[PDB]
Amino acid sequence: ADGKSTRYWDCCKPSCGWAKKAPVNQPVFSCNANFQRLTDFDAKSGCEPGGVAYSCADQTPWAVNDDFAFGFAATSIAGSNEAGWCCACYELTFTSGPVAGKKMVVQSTSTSNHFDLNIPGGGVGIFDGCTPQFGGLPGQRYGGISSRNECDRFPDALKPGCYWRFDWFKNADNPSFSFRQVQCPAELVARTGCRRNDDGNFPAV
């Protein structure tokens, strides 16, 4: 299937971090304001007043080599729903921009085929949980940062993901991709803790 991408980091508890969204062993981990994993999967979202649960900084993208990366995304899969895509993994092959031909395997942690890649500095959008979390991230509310050097001021836990956008990802601007669902690699499940019960029904990367 083909899809289109965007990028974001709003610090919000991801939607697949709630219990009972999908048949999984446990939901996606959320974290406190200090980037520490929470044990209460029902913790109130930091994108609501008085909330305490935010997106974990280890749910960020990284390069394996110049041709292949791992990461996470908020998704909308045509014909499906959260019960089907929460914690599912997808192998993306980019089909436009400076990353055309490169592959990235992502795990859906939140919510046409559209993937909004988790990328610190991609923009906090309408929700802006980052302001309550730690006082705000650099960047335009919509669009986030524009230059690599802006990552230098990010919270240290969010820097690796921030730089990835400029380094591996070549500052690609909303690239298109083709994708296929795949069993989640251990490296992704290690970060979210969330493994789908149906993951034996899909091919390996």
Write a concise synopsis of the structure shown.
With 205 residues, this protein is an alpha+beta fold. It contains 4 helices and 7 strands. It catalyses: Endohydrolysis of (1->4)-beta-D-glucosidic linkages in cellulose, lichenin and cereal beta-D-glucans.
How large is the share of residues in beta strands? 15-25%
Could you say which overall geometry the principal axes of the C-alpha atoms support? Answer: globular
Return the CATH topology.
Answer: Barwin-like endoglucanases
> SSE order in H/E notation?
EEEHEEEHHEH
Q: Could you say how many structural domains there are in total? A: 1
Active site: 10
EC number: 3.2.1.4
Enzyme class: hydrolase
Family: Belongs to the glycosyl hydrolase 45 (cellulase K) family.
How are the secondary structure elements laid out?
Blueprint: E1 2-8, E2 62-65, E3 68-76, H1 82-85, E4 89-94, E5 103-110, E6 114-118, H2 130-134, H3 159-164, E7 176-182, H4 186-192
Parallel strand pairs: 1-6, 3-5
Antiparallel strand pairs: 1-7, 2-3, 3-6, 4-5, 4-7
